[PDB]
mmCIF file of N, CA and C in Angstrom:
data_model
loop_
_atom_site.group_PDB
_atom_site.id
_atom_site.type_symbol
_atom_site.label_atom_id
_atom_site.label_comp_id
_atom_site.label_asym_id
_atom_site.label_seq_id
_atom_site.Cartn_x
_atom_site.Cartn_y
_atom_site.Cartn_z
ATOM 1 N N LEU A 299 -57.125 -26.617 47.104
ATOM 2 C CA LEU A 299 -58.771 -27.127 47.544
ATOM 3 C C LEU A 299 -59.547 -27.480 46.510
ATOM 4 N N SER A 300 -59.920 -26.521 45.556
ATOM 5 C CA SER A 300 -60.820 -26.381 44.714
ATOM 6 C C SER A 300 -60.575 -27.805 43.882
ATOM 7 N N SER A 301 -59.541 -28.719 43.704
ATOM 8 C CA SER A 301 -59.480 -30.185 43.083
ATOM 9 C C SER A 301 -60.067 -30.702 43.587
ATOM 10 N N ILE A 302 -59.642 -30.992 45.384
ATOM 11 C CA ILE A 302 -60.616 -32.344 45.724
ATOM 12 C C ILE A 302 -62.281 -31.813 45.672
ATOM 13 N N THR A 303 -62.992 -31.178 45.563
ATOM 14 C CA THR A 303 -64.620 -31.001 44.957
ATOM 15 C C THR A 303 -64.583 -31.423 43.539
ATOM 16 N N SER A 304 -63.191 -31.623 42.567
ATOM 17 C CA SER A 304 -63.874 -32.153 41.670
ATOM 18 C C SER A 304 -62.924 -33.289 41.907
ATOM 19 N N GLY A 305 -61.660 -33.569 42.455
ATOM 20 C CA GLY A 305 -60.713 -35.051 42.114
ATOM 21 C C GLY A 305 -60.512 -34.961 40.972
ATOM 22 N N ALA A 306 -59.585 -34.104 40.389
ATOM 23 C CA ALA A 306 -58.651 -33.968 39.395
ATOM 24 C C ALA A 306 -57.038 -33.289 38.995
ATOM 25 N N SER A 307 -56.066 -33.671 39.773
ATOM 26 C CA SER A 307 -54.553 -33.577 39.367
ATOM 27 C C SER A 307 -54.459 -31.997 39.605
ATOM 28 N N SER A 308 -54.513 -31.855 41.277
ATOM 29 C CA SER A 308 -54.739 -30.272 41.479
ATOM 30 C C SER A 308 -53.274 -29.852 41.207
ATOM 31 N N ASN A 309 -53.291 -28.316 40.903
ATOM 32 C CA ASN A 309 -52.421 -27.456 40.486
ATOM 33 C C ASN A 309 -51.983 -27.694 39.069
ATOM 34 N N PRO A 310 -52.443 -27.935 37.949
ATOM 35 C CA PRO A 310 -52.091 -28.017 36.558
ATOM 36 C C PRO A 310 -50.843 -26.913 36.045
ATOM 37 N N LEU A 311 -51.143 -26.056 36.230
ATOM 38 C CA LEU A 311 -50.812 -25.017 35.298
ATOM 39 C C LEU A 311 -49.202 -24.797 35.719
ATOM 40 N N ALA A 312 -48.444 -25.119 36.991
ATOM 41 C CA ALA A 312 -47.746 -24.606 37.318
ATOM 42 C C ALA A 312 -46.955 -26.179 37.316
ATOM 43 N N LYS A 313 -47.840 -27.367 37.173
ATOM 44 C CA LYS A 313 -46.690 -28.513 37.201
ATOM 45 C C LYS A 313 -46.391 -28.048 35.104
ATOM 46 N N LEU A 314 -47.088 -28.006 34.578
ATOM 47 C CA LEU A 314 -46.697 -28.315 32.694
ATOM 48 C C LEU A 314 -45.334 -27.372 32.819
ATOM 49 N N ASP A 315 -45.031 -25.925 33.172
ATOM 50 C CA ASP A 315 -44.136 -25.192 32.967
ATOM 51 C C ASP A 315 -43.147 -25.481 33.535
ATOM 52 N N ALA A 316 -42.865 -26.989 34.372
ATOM 53 C CA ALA A 316 -41.468 -27.620 34.205
ATOM 54 C C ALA A 316 -41.079 -27.926 33.226
ATOM 55 N N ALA A 317 -42.110 -28.846 33.231
ATOM 56 C CA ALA A 317 -42.040 -29.776 31.770
ATOM 57 C C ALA A 317 -41.118 -28.724 30.409
ATOM 58 N N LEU A 318 -42.111 -27.577 30.463
ATOM 59 C CA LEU A 318 -41.534 -26.493 29.325
ATOM 60 C C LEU A 318 -39.856 -26.475 29.618
ATOM 61 N N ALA A 319 -39.530 -26.092 30.700
ATOM 62 C CA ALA A 319 -38.071 -25.637 31.320
ATOM 63 C C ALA A 319 -37.909 -26.774 31.237
ATOM 64 N N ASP A 320 -37.537 -28.002 31.384
ATOM 65 C CA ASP A 320 -36.650 -28.775 30.761
ATOM 66 C C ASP A 320 -36.449 -29.351 29.630
ATOM 67 N N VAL A 321 -37.200 -29.144 28.715
ATOM 68 C CA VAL A 321 -37.065 -29.491 27.353
ATOM 69 C C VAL A 321 -36.534 -28.168 26.960
ATOM 70 N N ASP A 322 -36.790 -27.366 27.577
ATOM 71 C CA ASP A 322 -35.398 -26.061 26.666
ATOM 72 C C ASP A 322 -34.352 -25.993 26.908
ATOM 73 N N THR A 323 -33.929 -26.902 28.778
ATOM 74 C CA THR A 323 -32.468 -26.838 28.815
ATOM 75 C C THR A 323 -31.845 -27.611 27.828
ATOM 76 N N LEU A 324 -32.489 -28.917 27.202
ATOM 77 C CA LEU A 324 -31.559 -29.669 26.452
ATOM 78 C C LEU A 324 -31.158 -28.526 25.235
ATOM 79 N N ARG A 325 -32.097 -28.310 24.450
ATOM 80 C CA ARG A 325 -31.950 -27.796 23.452
ATOM 81 C C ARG A 325 -30.763 -26.837 23.649
ATOM 82 N N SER A 326 -30.941 -25.689 24.462
ATOM 83 C CA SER A 326 -30.143 -25.009 24.592
ATOM 84 C C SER A 326 -28.346 -26.030 24.646
ATOM 85 N N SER A 327 -28.541 -26.580 25.640
ATOM 86 C CA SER A 327 -27.298 -27.179 25.590
ATOM 87 C C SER A 327 -26.661 -28.392 24.159
ATOM 88 N N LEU A 328 -27.360 -28.548 23.635
ATOM 89 C CA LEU A 328 -27.314 -29.020 22.402
ATOM 90 C C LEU A 328 -26.496 -27.617 21.694
ATOM 91 N N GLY A 329 -27.574 -26.888 21.127
ATOM 92 C CA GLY A 329 -26.773 -25.927 20.366
ATOM 93 C C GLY A 329 -25.347 -25.769 21.183
ATOM 94 N N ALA A 330 -25.206 -25.272 22.183
ATOM 95 C CA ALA A 330 -23.973 -24.974 22.281
ATOM 96 C C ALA A 330 -23.046 -25.617 21.948
ATOM 97 N N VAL A 331 -23.414 -26.786 22.214
ATOM 98 C CA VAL A 331 -22.434 -27.887 22.172
ATOM 99 C C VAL A 331 -21.806 -27.912 20.492
ATOM 100 N N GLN A 332 -23.010 -27.726 19.481
ATOM 101 C CA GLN A 332 -22.904 -26.920 18.026
ATOM 102 C C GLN A 332 -22.043 -26.350 17.380
ATOM 103 N N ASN A 333 -21.940 -25.205 18.415
ATOM 104 C CA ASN A 333 -21.261 -23.966 18.115
ATOM 105 C C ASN A 333 -19.374 -24.951 18.215
ATOM 106 N N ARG A 334 -18.635 -25.158 19.419
ATOM 107 C CA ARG A 334 -17.885 -25.265 19.410
ATOM 108 C C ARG A 334 -16.961 -26.680 18.493
ATOM 109 N N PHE A 335 -18.551 -27.468 18.532
ATOM 110 C CA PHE A 335 -17.980 -28.574 17.549
ATOM 111 C C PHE A 335 -18.046 -28.441 15.974
ATOM 112 N N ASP A 336 -18.177 -27.229 15.521
ATOM 113 C CA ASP A 336 -18.564 -27.074 14.543
ATOM 114 C C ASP A 336 -16.322 -25.966 14.284
ATOM 115 N N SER A 337 -16.497 -25.114 15.259
ATOM 116 C CA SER A 337 -14.818 -23.769 15.194
ATOM 117 C C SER A 337 -13.954 -25.435 14.961
ATOM 118 N N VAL A 338 -14.025 -26.525 15.829
ATOM 119 C CA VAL A 338 -13.277 -27.843 15.251
ATOM 120 C C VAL A 338 -12.993 -27.270 14.037
ATOM 121 N N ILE A 339 -13.811 -27.675 13.104
ATOM 122 C CA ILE A 339 -13.550 -28.479 11.640
ATOM 123 C C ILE A 339 -12.598 -27.085 11.234
ATOM 124 N N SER A 340 -12.764 -25.957 11.491
ATOM 125 C CA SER A 340 -12.137 -25.081 10.668
ATOM 126 C C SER A 340 -11.166 -24.504 10.814
ATOM 127 N N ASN A 341 -10.765 -24.842 12.263
ATOM 128 C CA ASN A 341 -9.237 -24.925 12.636
ATOM 129 C C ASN A 341 -8.417 -26.437 12.097
ATOM 130 N N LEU A 342 -8.955 -27.362 12.152
ATOM 131 C CA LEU A 342 -8.390 -28.528 11.609
ATOM 132 C C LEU A 342 -8.095 -28.742 10.342
ATOM 133 N N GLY A 343 -8.962 -27.596 9.089
ATOM 134 C CA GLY A 343 -8.983 -27.655 7.726
ATOM 135 C C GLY A 343 -7.453 -26.663 7.768
ATOM 136 N N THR A 344 -7.427 -25.496 8.079
ATOM 137 C CA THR A 344 -6.333 -24.678 8.329
ATOM 138 C C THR A 344 -4.802 -25.717 8.233
ATOM 139 N N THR A 345 -4.579 -26.355 9.638
ATOM 140 C CA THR A 345 -3.399 -27.071 10.060
ATOM 141 C C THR A 345 -2.916 -27.932 8.928
ATOM 142 N N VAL A 346 -3.815 -28.217 8.341
ATOM 143 C CA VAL A 346 -3.558 -29.385 6.958
ATOM 144 C C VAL A 346 -2.855 -29.039 6.203
ATOM 145 N N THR A 347 -3.274 -27.630 5.951
ATOM 146 C CA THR A 347 -2.655 -27.023 4.720
ATOM 147 C C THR A 347 -0.996 -26.696 4.586
ATOM 148 N N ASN A 348 -1.249 -26.355 6.109
ATOM 149 C CA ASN A 348 0.399 -25.531 6.660
ATOM 150 C C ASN A 348 1.160 -26.938 6.579
ATOM 151 N N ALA B 51 40.901 -23.370 -4.044
ATOM 152 C CA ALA B 51 39.306 -23.681 -3.884
ATOM 153 C C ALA B 51 38.638 -24.762 -3.388
ATOM 154 N N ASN B 52 39.726 -25.440 -2.058
ATOM 155 C CA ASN B 52 38.757 -26.268 -1.147
ATOM 156 C C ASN B 52 38.376 -25.975 -0.821
ATOM 157 N N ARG B 53 38.480 -24.420 0.431
ATOM 158 C CA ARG B 53 37.996 -23.963 0.942
ATOM 159 C C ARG B 53 36.882 -23.058 0.447
ATOM 160 N N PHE B 54 36.587 -22.700 -0.458
ATOM 161 C CA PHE B 54 35.844 -22.183 -1.541
ATOM 162 C C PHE B 54 34.656 -22.903 -1.292
ATOM 163 N N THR B 55 34.800 -24.317 -1.669
ATOM 164 C CA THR B 55 34.228 -25.465 -1.862
ATOM 165 C C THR B 55 33.458 -25.712 -0.067
ATOM 166 N N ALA B 56 34.361 -25.385 0.746
ATOM 167 C CA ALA B 56 33.470 -25.811 2.239
ATOM 168 C C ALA B 56 32.505 -25.061 2.958
ATOM 169 N N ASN B 57 32.372 -23.703 2.197
ATOM 170 C CA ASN B 57 31.665 -22.838 2.605
ATOM 171 C C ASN B 57 30.155 -23.089 1.461
ATOM 172 N N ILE B 58 30.502 -22.956 0.125
ATOM 173 C CA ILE B 58 29.228 -23.393 0.282
ATOM 174 C C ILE B 58 28.834 -24.377 -0.208
ATOM 175 N N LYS B 59 29.119 -25.890 0.382
ATOM 176 C CA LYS B 59 28.440 -26.525 0.832
ATOM 177 C C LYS B 59 27.780 -26.417 1.974
ATOM 178 N N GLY B 60 28.351 -25.582 3.358
ATOM 179 C CA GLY B 60 27.961 -25.288 4.492
ATOM 180 C C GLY B 60 26.513 -24.251 4.120
ATOM 181 N N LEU B 61 26.727 -23.769 3.194
ATOM 182 C CA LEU B 61 25.262 -22.010 3.540
ATOM 183 C C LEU B 61 24.672 -23.027 2.548
ATOM 184 N N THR B 62 24.903 -24.053 2.120
ATOM 185 C CA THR B 62 23.198 -24.212 1.011
ATOM 186 C C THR B 62 22.376 -25.152 2.107
ATOM 187 N N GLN B 63 22.980 -25.411 2.924
ATOM 188 C CA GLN B 63 22.342 -26.360 4.078
ATOM 189 C C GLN B 63 22.277 -25.371 5.328
ATOM 190 N N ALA B 64 23.011 -24.449 4.964
ATOM 191 C CA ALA B 64 22.005 -23.316 5.907
ATOM 192 C C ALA B 64 21.061 -22.492 5.410
ATOM 193 N N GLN B 65 20.608 -22.968 4.332
ATOM 194 C CA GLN B 65 19.486 -21.916 3.347
ATOM 195 C C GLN B 65 18.560 -22.594 3.588
ATOM 196 N N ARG B 66 18.236 -23.917 4.181
ATOM 197 C CA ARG B 66 17.336 -24.487 4.532
ATOM 198 C C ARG B 66 17.079 -24.905 5.653
ATOM 199 N N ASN B 67 17.662 -24.397 6.734
ATOM 200 C CA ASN B 67 17.312 -24.221 8.174
ATOM 201 C C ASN B 67 16.503 -22.981 8.421
ATOM 202 N N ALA B 68 16.220 -22.473 7.385
ATOM 203 C CA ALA B 68 16.021 -20.790 6.843
ATOM 204 C C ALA B 68 14.132 -21.540 7.428
ATOM 205 N N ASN B 69 14.119 -22.303 5.835
ATOM 206 C CA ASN B 69 12.859 -22.174 5.121
ATOM 207 C C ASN B 69 12.114 -23.550 6.775
ATOM 208 N N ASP B 70 12.838 -24.336 8.018
ATOM 209 C CA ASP B 70 12.480 -24.672 8.574
ATOM 210 C C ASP B 70 11.754 -23.431 9.682
ATOM 211 N N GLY B 71 12.642 -22.399 9.867
ATOM 212 C CA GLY B 71 12.190 -21.472 10.953
ATOM 213 C C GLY B 71 10.671 -21.417 10.384
ATOM 214 N N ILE B 72 10.683 -20.103 9.248
ATOM 215 C CA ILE B 72 9.127 -20.233 8.175
ATOM 216 C C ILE B 72 8.619 -20.330 8.801
ATOM 217 N N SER B 73 8.834 -22.232 8.579
ATOM 218 C CA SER B 73 7.254 -22.937 9.040
ATOM 219 C C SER B 73 6.275 -22.723 9.507
ATOM 220 N N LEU B 74 7.610 -23.186 11.108
ATOM 221 C CA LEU B 74 7.372 -23.218 12.119
ATOM 222 C C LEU B 74 6.628 -21.860 12.491
ATOM 223 N N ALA B 75 7.202 -20.842 12.283
ATOM 224 C CA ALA B 75 6.531 -19.527 12.633
ATOM 225 C C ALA B 75 4.736 -19.423 11.916
ATOM 226 N N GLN B 76 4.731 -20.223 10.774
ATOM 227 C CA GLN B 76 3.390 -20.174 9.787
ATOM 228 C C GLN B 76 2.885 -20.944 11.037
ATOM 229 N N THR B 77 2.927 -21.619 10.955
ATOM 230 C CA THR B 77 1.897 -22.984 11.938
ATOM 231 C C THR B 77 1.341 -22.118 13.171
ATOM 232 N N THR B 78 2.012 -21.127 14.010
ATOM 233 C CA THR B 78 1.823 -20.902 15.473
ATOM 234 C C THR B 78 0.545 -20.392 14.862
ATOM 235 N N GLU B 79 0.656 -19.696 14.034
ATOM 236 C CA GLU B 79 -0.843 -18.090 13.463
ATOM 237 C C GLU B 79 -1.761 -18.983 13.603
ATOM 238 N N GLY B 80 -1.951 -20.007 12.477
ATOM 239 C CA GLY B 80 -3.461 -20.595 12.618
ATOM 240 C C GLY B 80 -4.020 -20.958 13.521
ATOM 241 N N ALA B 81 -2.811 -21.605 14.907
ATOM 242 C CA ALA B 81 -3.771 -21.694 15.577
ATOM 243 C C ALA B 81 -3.967 -20.662 16.448
ATOM 244 N N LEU B 82 -3.493 -19.271 16.577
ATOM 245 C CA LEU B 82 -3.487 -18.561 17.073
ATOM 246 C C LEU B 82 -5.266 -17.690 17.210
ATOM 247 N N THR B 83 -5.187 -17.834 15.394
ATOM 248 C CA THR B 83 -6.733 -17.040 15.121
ATOM 249 C C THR B 83 -7.528 -17.821 16.045
ATOM 250 N N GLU B 84 -8.033 -18.916 16.462
ATOM 251 C CA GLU B 84 -8.961 -19.732 16.566
ATOM 252 C C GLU B 84 -9.150 -18.793 17.537
ATOM 253 N N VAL B 85 -8.094 -18.931 18.809
ATOM 254 C CA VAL B 85 -8.071 -18.409 20.395
ATOM 255 C C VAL B 85 -8.470 -16.731 19.966
ATOM 256 N N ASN B 86 -8.283 -16.095 19.001
ATOM 257 C CA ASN B 86 -9.362 -14.889 18.841
ATOM 258 C C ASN B 86 -10.299 -15.052 19.350
ATOM 259 N N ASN B 87 -10.830 -15.794 17.724
ATOM 260 C CA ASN B 87 -11.818 -15.641 17.336
ATOM 261 C C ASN B 87 -13.224 -16.248 18.540
ATOM 262 N N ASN B 88 -12.439 -17.308 19.626
ATOM 263 C CA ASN B 88 -13.207 -17.498 20.710
ATOM 264 C C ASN B 88 -13.418 -16.082 22.164
ATOM 265 N N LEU B 89 -12.441 -15.472 22.400
ATOM 266 C CA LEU B 89 -12.584 -13.829 22.988
ATOM 267 C C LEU B 89 -12.827 -13.539 22.469
ATOM 268 N N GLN B 90 -13.357 -12.513 20.993
ATOM 269 C CA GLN B 90 -14.794 -12.067 20.531
ATOM 270 C C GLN B 90 -15.860 -12.345 20.922
ATOM 271 N N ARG B 91 -15.899 -13.352 21.344
ATOM 272 C CA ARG B 91 -17.863 -13.795 21.188
ATOM 273 C C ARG B 91 -17.838 -13.773 22.648
ATOM 274 N N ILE B 92 -17.044 -14.464 24.001
ATOM 275 C CA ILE B 92 -16.830 -14.327 24.951
ATOM 276 C C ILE B 92 -17.858 -12.884 25.577
ATOM 277 N N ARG B 93 -16.648 -11.802 25.245
ATOM 278 C CA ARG B 93 -17.031 -10.323 25.127
ATOM 279 C C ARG B 93 -18.221 -10.081 24.922
ATOM 280 N N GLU B 94 -18.397 -10.563 24.220
ATOM 281 C CA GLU B 94 -20.210 -10.223 23.296
ATOM 282 C C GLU B 94 -21.261 -10.616 24.202
ATOM 283 N N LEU B 95 -20.765 -12.157 24.815
ATOM 284 C CA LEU B 95 -21.968 -12.911 25.529
ATOM 285 C C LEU B 95 -21.589 -12.031 26.803
ATOM 286 N N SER B 96 -20.654 -11.849 27.429
ATOM 287 C CA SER B 96 -20.878 -10.736 28.355
ATOM 288 C C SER B 96 -21.900 -9.785 28.620
ATOM 289 N N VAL B 97 -21.218 -8.970 28.087
ATOM 290 C CA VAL B 97 -22.506 -7.893 27.104
ATOM 291 C C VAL B 97 -23.914 -8.448 27.628
ATOM 292 N N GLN B 98 -24.162 -9.131 27.299
ATOM 293 C CA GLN B 98 -25.507 -9.616 27.010
ATOM 294 C C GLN B 98 -26.363 -9.535 28.521
ATOM 295 N N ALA B 99 -25.539 -10.121 29.386
ATOM 296 C CA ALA B 99 -25.431 -10.263 30.895
ATOM 297 C C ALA B 99 -25.283 -9.453 31.486
ATOM 298 N N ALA B 100 -25.646 -8.474 31.206
ATOM 299 C CA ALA B 100 -25.370 -6.732 32.036
ATOM 300 C C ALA B 100 -26.493 -6.430 32.440
#
């Protein structure tokens, strides 16, 4: 109700936190990918020697 | 002399078959190492979630 008296974008603080969460999820998924995608190299190098 | 020759020739190739076996056994171990390394990390992550 406080917004209507001023007319500026009601409930900003909770509106912006979802944006922060959305970027965080993407970053976490990318890091998870990186770890597996590194382990592959270590396996692959050994098999070639054998 | 003929029956000496026969067994010499047979044994020589029997000697190579063992090398085939050693190579197969050696190759499997490199595969199993990475499985172990992944399980080690899964357990530790599960520790964090309790």
